[PDB]
Design a binder for this molecule. Sequence first.
Ligand SMILES: NC(=O)c1ccc[n+]([C@@H]2O[C@H](COP(=O)([O-])OP(=O)(O)OC[C@H]3O[C@@H](n4cnc5c(N)ncnc54)[C@H](O)[C@@H]3O)[C@@H](O)[C@H]2O)c1
Lengths: 222, 213
Amino acid sequence: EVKLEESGGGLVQPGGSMKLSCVASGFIFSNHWMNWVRQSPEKGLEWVAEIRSKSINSATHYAESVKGRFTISRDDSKSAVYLQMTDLRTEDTGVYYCSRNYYGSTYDYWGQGTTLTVSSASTKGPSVFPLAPSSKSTSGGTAALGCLVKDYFPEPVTVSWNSGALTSGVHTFPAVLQSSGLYSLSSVVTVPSSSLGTQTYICNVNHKPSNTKVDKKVEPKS
Amino acid sequence: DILLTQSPAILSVSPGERVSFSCRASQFVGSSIHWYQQRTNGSPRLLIKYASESMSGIPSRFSGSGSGTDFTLSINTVESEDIADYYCQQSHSWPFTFGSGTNLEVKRTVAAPSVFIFPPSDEQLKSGTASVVCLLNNFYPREAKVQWKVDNALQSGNSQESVTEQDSKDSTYSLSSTLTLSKADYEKHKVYACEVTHQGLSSPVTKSFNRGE
Ligand SMILES: NC(=O)c1ccc[n+]([C@@H]2O[C@H](COP(=O)([O-])OP(=O)(O)OC[C@H]3O[C@@H](n4cnc5c(N)ncnc54)[C@H](O)[C@@H]3O)[C@@H](O)[C@H]2O)c1
């Protein structure tokens, strides 16, 4: 199985620098051309940079919008491709995908993306509060519970339930920017009302930019 | 550079029907058009290479055709699993470019939301703020109205909504509405109520609690 795994995203001030990494497995890395492709609401999917094989001088190519600011490199001994970004702009904000292109044709494998935010605001880790079920959160045989993940910056946060064992019925809402400039979101799940007080429900919140890793047990109230 | 135009940008089809996505190139690209599917929170997945060649493991209901400048991705029978954004990409010449994407919505029968209200946690109240959350779960169509009433006084300017993308398993939406007050203002009132109207509800649904019970 081919896997591509990016890392290094986060928050940086305008004009700043940041290096993204991607580690590949499942193909002969040194033979293939590694790419970064970014995605934003405004520009959609956008090819950023490519580095080809060492056999053809590890040749690099850049989109015109990043040329002179970004440098793509590879370490074949680590099966790694890197994107060193400098002089970053607000409009460089977006999700950055590691991707293989098959010798100038399809992007036939993609990573999961790593998020870059270019902004002058500061990192802030969230507070996590339970959305506690009762009877006004019980619709017959179904109850709802959740976690409120409030006042953080930048995007993203990830929320899992019971360390990933619970995925059915989960809704993690898009984050909303509050007037304070901080994000907030809720993650909810619907469960059998009979399971309240007999099954444990824990939301696992991770906000990497603040090194926040919180597990919140959500219990019915008093 | 070659511009790929995907129009319409939004398609809505009933389950079981055929749908076609359009990708038009501003210059000749031969057959070098590739199609990708990107589900919500997911990565692009290559479906069709070179206009018509479906990748291994792609369901047989996906096909592609076209050459020159006019290309079509087709899904013969549409299931809710096909809810996604669909992108074309050319590799006829450098730099490679992508279309802006077309979103697929899959219609379904009307589904009224299940409604739930959540008081603010004791934990958050110690921090001087109260968030009250109203959840509308698994409804269709997307249009819904949520109103906050505090001792029957209609609230304005102190709530925000968030809606999920359409669910690829049941074609529904879910919505959260969060009312934010200072603790001082929260403790000045008793009845907190979320009132919901939706095409599937024969009369508006109110979920409420009394502060401290
Ligand atoms: N001249 C060709 O190699 C050629 C010609 C036509 C078609 N193809 C197709 O291309 C596909 C893959 O070809 P391929 O050569 O890229 O890999 P491969 O899958 O054919 O690998 C075969 C073996 O060659 C060695 N190899 C390949 N690259 C190496 C490297 N950098 N360092 C050390 N050993 C290496 C490895 O031992 C590898 O297990 C195959 O499916 C083949 O059918 C290749």
